[PDB]
Amino acid sequence: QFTERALTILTLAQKLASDHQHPQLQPIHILAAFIETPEDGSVPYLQNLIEKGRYDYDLFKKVVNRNLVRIPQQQPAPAEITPSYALGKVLQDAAKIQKQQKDSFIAQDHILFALFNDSSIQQIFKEAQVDIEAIKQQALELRGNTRIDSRGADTNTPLEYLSKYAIDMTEQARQGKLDPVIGREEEIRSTIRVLARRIKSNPCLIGEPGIGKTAIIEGVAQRIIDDDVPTILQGAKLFSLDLAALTGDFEERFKGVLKEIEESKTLIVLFIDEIHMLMGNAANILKPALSRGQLKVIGATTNNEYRSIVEKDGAFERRFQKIEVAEPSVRQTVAILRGLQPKYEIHHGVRILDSALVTAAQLAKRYLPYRRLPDSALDLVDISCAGVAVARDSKPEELDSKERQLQLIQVEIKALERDEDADSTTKDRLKLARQKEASLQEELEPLRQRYNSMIQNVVDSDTISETAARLTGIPVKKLSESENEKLIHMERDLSSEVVGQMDAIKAVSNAVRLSRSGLANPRQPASFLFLGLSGSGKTELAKKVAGFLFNDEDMMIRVDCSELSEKYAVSKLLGTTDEGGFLTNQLQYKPYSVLLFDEVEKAHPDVLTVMLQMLDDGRITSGQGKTIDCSNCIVIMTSNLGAEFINSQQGSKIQESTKNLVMGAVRQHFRPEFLNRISSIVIFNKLSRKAIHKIVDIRLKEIEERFEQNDKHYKLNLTQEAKDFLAKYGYSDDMGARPLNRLIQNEILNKLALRILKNEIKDKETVNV
Amino acid sequence: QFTERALTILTLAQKLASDHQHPQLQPIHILAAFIETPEDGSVPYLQNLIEKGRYDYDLFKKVVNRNLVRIPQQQPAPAEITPSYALGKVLQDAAKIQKQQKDSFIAQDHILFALFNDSSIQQIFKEAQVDIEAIKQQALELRGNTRIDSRGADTNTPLEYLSKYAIDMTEQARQGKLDPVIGREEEIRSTIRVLARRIKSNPCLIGEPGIGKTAIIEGVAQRIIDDDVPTILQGAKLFSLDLAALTGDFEERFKGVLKEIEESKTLIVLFIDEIHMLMGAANILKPALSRGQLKVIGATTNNEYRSIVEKDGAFERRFQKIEVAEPSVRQTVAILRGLQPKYEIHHGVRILDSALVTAAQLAKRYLPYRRLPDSALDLVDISCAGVAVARDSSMIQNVVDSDTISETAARLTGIPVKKLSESENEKLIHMERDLSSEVVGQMDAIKAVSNAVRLSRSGLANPRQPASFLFLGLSGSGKTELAKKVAGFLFNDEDMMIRVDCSELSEKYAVSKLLGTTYDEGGFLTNQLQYKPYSVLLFDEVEKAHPDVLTVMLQMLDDGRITSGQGKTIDCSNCIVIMTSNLGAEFINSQQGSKIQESTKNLVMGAVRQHFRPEFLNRISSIVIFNKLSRKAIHKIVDIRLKEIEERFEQNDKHYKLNLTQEAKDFLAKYGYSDDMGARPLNRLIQNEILNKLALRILKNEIKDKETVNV
């Protein structure tokens, strides 16, 4: 029976016979129904069955232009009020070729197929078209199996199906649309290598999103249109799925392509993005036909996505090769960074300095966990591009904002200036707010000098820096010193925190360099187990550590063994059975990071055994199966074991002696393998007033941080006795004045807050004990 | 007036007859002027209502200039000098179809329409313009309502129903029709920035709505049409969808609109607004966006991100998310003073910052809920309303602090006088004695906690981290009230206190407290804080509370802003979190002999010190034993009771005066203190041996009203 789009074909010739009011359904109605518009966009029109198969239709188009118009006038109701069995025998008569394409029901060409019998102008010049086979011929010769039922434009497009969802960039290659690629070359060649196997030509590409997996396909095709596509392979071209909404459940559509491309005679390839579809329920789709052994297909993924269906299946594995895509090198980046370097700056109407370009690739490489320098660099770049190119675009937004920066404060002081009042009046406030606009007054003439944008080239710095500042912050560290001088001065830097343990610090400062230069295996943690008490820097140190190292407090990550006596491989994120992502998340949130474990001395067979992997390889597996870099991660361990011996530090015990004395204890608590990935273990020993009162002062230093800093400007007084009193009552042998630290506020802040409440403190008014 | 678009042709039709310098303007002229070239950029060719209505113009493209070259040539001034009312009627004659097809001005169809008589090949073979046949036919095909104004873009299927559901604000921009948002360019800084990425132009305002999110998009369109957007962006334009939702299912129009715009020369960026949605979609509105095209902007809460962006991440791969931050005071004060002139004249009044900031101040505290600037305005509006309501039934138009604050505040809540009164200073200072009210003794926490919480406020420590309390005593000592006292003191409410018993909390209760959608409930914890961001949390048997608990308690201990299970994170700090343990009941035996607290405290802590990850402990502001009754309490506890006597009763309700023997103190005080339960049981008793013993006189009237008796 007819296609609904034949019906839609019918709709038009009718709609024609409706709008153009033809009183009956005649032979020649359906050409306008056929032809979309003078385009060949109808399978009947030019690229059509007709013109190439036997005779040109554009002629029999050109002439029927009148035939359409030679229809007589009608009045409103009667136009085409009849099915016109004279025409309408095709209701039955079109059944000729409907199935003979190996199909279900009748189609455009196929209703037309019976029209060479029915609809035609068969005359001195016979206007009847491709004659005996030629239609059916070209019905097959163009697509063929062109339709099934009612669905999709009846003999849609110039050919048939596919081309809607068939997407070829060899075109875009030969159209130049495609980015050149780098460095996946033999990788492609390996993908290319996949392709010869009568067993499996079908790759799967394992690795991070955004890595270029699709952009990979460029060079794939690029080298294909380069005819670096080899012999067997040359015949194919680019095709891959652009996931279409099925628009009940229409995967038949998506079944449609299958034999279509199968019939299509290996002229193209199939690539599939990521979900290679595992429906929660559609299950096998194409899979057996996919399993047939024709149908070249490309897979791509990262680990767990791969881990999704095939682990069930294995037939994909049985039907594919999985191929990791390594996150490309920074210079791979740097290189192909330059690829669209000209592009995006011209996309963004600007210029670039590779200085930044490498610089991000330098810097950003560390600092975006999720996205990938394989892109994110560029992503920074477009980012780098825009705002500055925006600082070019509408004018600088800075110019455009410098009108806004005053814009309210000029009209907000209105209410201040509306009526004189006893509070906000012109005594101070109306003059006070005048300083902001005065601070905003001085840019204009110096800045208007610039344009009346010039920066076109990306700055190195801000394009990283300011953007990094946009991205994270504290540029000054990210600004200049890289990897290095931090080290030399690290200790003396870290010497801030608590003196003593300096060697350990040195060892740390050592081990971090062990953590660098790659001498020590660049796949390996930085393994740190610490001895001491509360207050002692298991307490503390990590605070400085990443703050030094990663410049953060929170790369430091908290873990308590006390929590974990038995199963926490359960909540480690076990294999989903309820989502334990924490540990994973902890990195999965935070890759360049510092790992504090608490109660480590109590670490239970579970937690320790993954510590081994943590100890291992600088990588961390998941329960879901993902493995995750520990190398750039720093590990931190509370150990109070020799607390005895720690307490014995009353004697200020010979450290190593008491260390040895300790060692057995920890030596007991831990298998050597643990012990033998440990890059160091150190006490955090006795404290000197020298230390103490400074450490005391250390918080005293930072009191301001909000207070005199981001709020009060309070001018600080302390009596040295108090400064000693701090130690004196406050310092706890075992726990330090860290307890007193919690107290501090009481004897300090509230004591002030009291005055604050009082107002005997006005700003800088200060009286202490 | 004629349509510009029409007149664009019309004068160009006058220009048409001018180029060949025609002698006269005559019917078949503009048949050339309607068409630059066969492109649908000239609709009269194909997209014309005639080619679809009656006469296709393809070959009929042939004849138009054939006449206008065969017009007798003229010289410049007589060219376009005449309407030649035969044609000159088309000026008026174009106004005929605006009737039957319902239009107002004279449009491209209309200028066309009038022509339908002689503008043509009119012969035995007539290739011409049918009169009503092509247009009223296809003037619905085209459009279906054509008429807007002489102004505007093409009047022939420009996306298909371009406006059919997305207003152009760049209209109102170019029209200057919206109060330009303020402090918003740094947002815009994102936007334009967000844009030029060939990867993702796609901004998303992500976070609790109601800040006036897309209001920000104003300047966008403005600075679009201000030319304050850059060259990449200047061709683009800004519309905002209006959902036409009906029913097969029109959302293919929601697809069709797509087929408009990127196919429209991507000449816009549509702003999608608040819900960007897998229908509770698949590929809808993605595919061309997904095509790496379709420059477009959505926004929503985190939650939908937290919902839908959890479903894909290609959205993340489609979009750049952008956080939204409800303005602080001045950040608000902008929109305040920005909109201060506005609704005062909108709602017909006038304003002072007097209330304005204060509203912002007070409301943002005391309005619990929404985005202050909104609500502040909303307040202000309704503040401005009630006064305007008060005004015309008008000694004021301008509005000041007080009722605009307070009544309105009261109209929100109540007790202006407090909210009126204090900047917390006295509430800081004299609270000493004032807090001292409820609990005799335990001046320590009284001293401390107040002073402490005084220090908890002022922000001299983490701006985000709350006032943190775990307490010691016996439940029944008034501490709980003391909270409610102090909350009621501070927060001007008891309900600030919130009840979750650690006894109710076993292990998996971390569910029932709160949860990631799935039951699906407002995290009960939040759900009240979510309701009431300024509040108090006293949770006891903390000892039972299972350290599974404390992690959020930690968060709650921490940082003063607290996630939901769905993740929504909200201020802890402006609520106060309180705990007790019963541990020291043993050690209480010391203070049962009133014995040295610190001594036993030292003893005491070890207990609690044994019970927790230290951090838990180590957040708390302080922890305090609450001593058992000295007589001082009792008679005051009596006074308390005495106070809750007279509440409504000894006058407004009962009107019965009350005297007491010292027995009436002592007879209680005899049984006053339960060991465990203190006066708490007794506090029930006056109900009985007194009130219900008075029910004697009461239930009868037996001795008269206003009497005063004891036992």
Ligand SMILES: Nc1ncnc2c1ncn2[C@@H]1O[C@H](COP(=O)(O)OP(=O)(O)NP(=O)(O)O)[C@@H](O)[C@H]1O
């Ligand atoms: N080797 C490359 N050559 C050219 N462009 C590249 C290359 N790698 C990445 N890109 C660009 O990166 C952008 C998209 O990266 P993409 O190829 O999607 O990474 P991906 O790992 O393939 N993510 P996806 O394939 O979508 O799952 C496009 O603009 C590409 O042009």
Ligand SMILES: Nc1ncnc2c1ncn2[C@@H]1O[C@H](COP(=O)(O)OP(=O)(O)NP(=O)(O)O)[C@@H](O)[C@H]1O
């Ligand atoms: N090595 C140190 N570096 C910095 N601050 C230190 C150090 N030792 C003591 N302090 C002081 O202690 C404060 C922080 O103590 P903190 O590290 O939080 O204890 P903790 O984290 O609870 N760990 P713990 O003592 O083992 O229970 C700092 O602000 C300093 O005033």
Ligand SMILES: Nc1ncnc2c1ncn2[C@@H]1O[C@H](COP(=O)(O)OP(=O)(O)NP(=O)(O)O)[C@@H](O)[C@H]1O
């Ligand atoms: N900077 C600003 N200046 C002035 N008015 C503003 C500003 N920001 C927001 N608004 C107001 O915010 C109100 C709401 O705008 P809108 O952007 O839709 O809010 P919203 O946060 O998006 N709420 P919703 O649309 O439900 O998500 C408007 O009345 C604007 O006037």
Ligand SMILES: Nc1ncnc2c1ncn2[C@@H]1O[C@H](COP(=O)(O)OP(=O)(O)NP(=O)(O)O)[C@@H](O)[C@H]1O
């Ligand atoms: N010194 C006091 N000041 C104020 N109220 C007190 C005092 N001593 C006891 N109370 C009363 O003790 C009762 C409850 O004390 P409270 O602090 O609420 O413990 P609790 O947590 O409520 N235990 P419970 O009453 O069983 O729920 C209230 O009726 C208070 O009035």
